[PDB]
Amino acid sequence: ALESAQESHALHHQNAAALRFQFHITREQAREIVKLCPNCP
Amino acid sequence: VNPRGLKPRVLWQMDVTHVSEFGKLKYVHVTVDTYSHFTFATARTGEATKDVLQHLAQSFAYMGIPQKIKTDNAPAYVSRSIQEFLARWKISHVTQAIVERTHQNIKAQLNKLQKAGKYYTPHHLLAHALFVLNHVNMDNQGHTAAERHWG
Amino acid sequence: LKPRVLWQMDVTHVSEFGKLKYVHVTVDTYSHFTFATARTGEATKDVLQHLAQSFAYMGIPQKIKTDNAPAYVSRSIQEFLARWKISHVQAIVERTHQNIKAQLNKLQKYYTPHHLLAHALFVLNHVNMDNQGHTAAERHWG
Amino acid sequence: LESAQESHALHHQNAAALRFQFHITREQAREIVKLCPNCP
Ligand SMILES: [Mg+2]
Ligand SMILES: [Mg+2]
Ligand SMILES: [Zn+2]
Ligand SMILES: [Zn+2]
C-alpha cells in the first residue's frame, strides 16, 4: 500500500490526509512522504 | 474568519489573481464556495467584463448556482453587464480572506506540479491542480471538497 | 454499478462552432454526469487536455471506454492513463451527444461556444432531474 | 408558475426541474415546455 502511496504523491502531491485514507497508511507515514517529497515544503 | 456559508451553494467568493508563469493567460479567475471550500478556476487573457461573464458560466457548470457571490470593487465586477447577468440568474451580489487563501492554495499546488512533468497549456496545469484540491485533498475526517459540496 | 467506475469518451461534431466544432464528450455510465469541451481538433493534445478537465470536473474513474480513434489508441494516451492508474478499453455516449446538441439548440446570445456549452452543461447536470427529483450531480456524488 | 415560466425562458430545463424547483403541477410544467418555441 505504501509503495502505491509514495508514487501517487509523486504524481499529484496531495496532502497526507489523502495518502492516509486512500492507501491506508499511518499518519506519521503519510506525513513523512510529504516532508520527504522535494516539492512539498 | 469572514462571513461564510452555513451550507453549500449559499455564499461564494470570486476574485482574480496573477500567475506570471502563464504569460498571456496570467489573469486567473478564482471562485470558491465559502462553506465547502469547493474551488473553481480559469486562466484567461484578461480581467475584463467578457472574461468574468465566461468564468461565471464555467463556475455554474462546475459548482452549481449560489444564492450570493462576494467580489471586490473591481471595475469589471461592478459593471452593468455583470449586474444584469446575475439579475436574470436570480443571483445576489455583495461587496475576503477565504478566496485570498484559495489564491495561495492554488499557487502552491501549481508550483508542485511542474516538477512532476511537463504540461501543454496553463489550462492543462490548472485542471490538474483543481482536481487535486477538490477531489483528492481531504480534511481530518477524510472528506474532499467535492464530497462536502455535494453532501 | 456505482459512480466513477466506468466512463465513456468520444468526440462529436457541432458545425455551428466552426473552428471549435470538435466537441469532446465524457459521460459517467452510472450517474450520466456529463462533461464536454469544444476544441480545435481531436488530436492527442486535445484529448489529453480534455482528460485533465474531465478529472477536475468529475473525478477519477476506474475504466474509460473509447472507440478506435487514432488519438485514443496513441501512446501518449496509453502512457498518460498508465501513470493515473486508469484502465482503458457505445450507445450511452451517443445518446449524450444527442442530449448535448438538443440543449445547445434551445439556448440560442452567447459570447463563444465555450459560453454556450457551459450553460448547456449546467442545465443537463445541475438543473434537469429524473422522476424522483435528482440531478446528475447529486447522483454522481450521492 | 410566474417564476417557473421565465426561468425556462433562460435555461430551457425539463418539466421535472420546473415541477420540483417551483412547485407546480406536472401538466403545468409540461405545458410550459410545449408552449416554449425552442422546445419541440
Ligand atoms: Mg480583484
Ligand atoms: Mg467517435
Ligand atoms: Zn509532493
Ligand atoms: Zn424551452
Swiss-Prot record, chain C:
Binding site for Mg(2+) 3: 10, 67, 94
Residue ranges constituting the Integrase catalytic domain according to the UniProt record: 1-142
Domain of life of the organism encoding this protein: Viruses
Physiological role: Catalyzes viral DNA integration into the host chromosome, by performing a series of DNA cutting and joining reactions.
Oligomeric and partner information: Homooctamer.
Entry protein name: Integrase
Organism: Mouse mammary tumor virus (strain BR6)
Included stretch of the parent chain: 1492 to 1645 of 1755
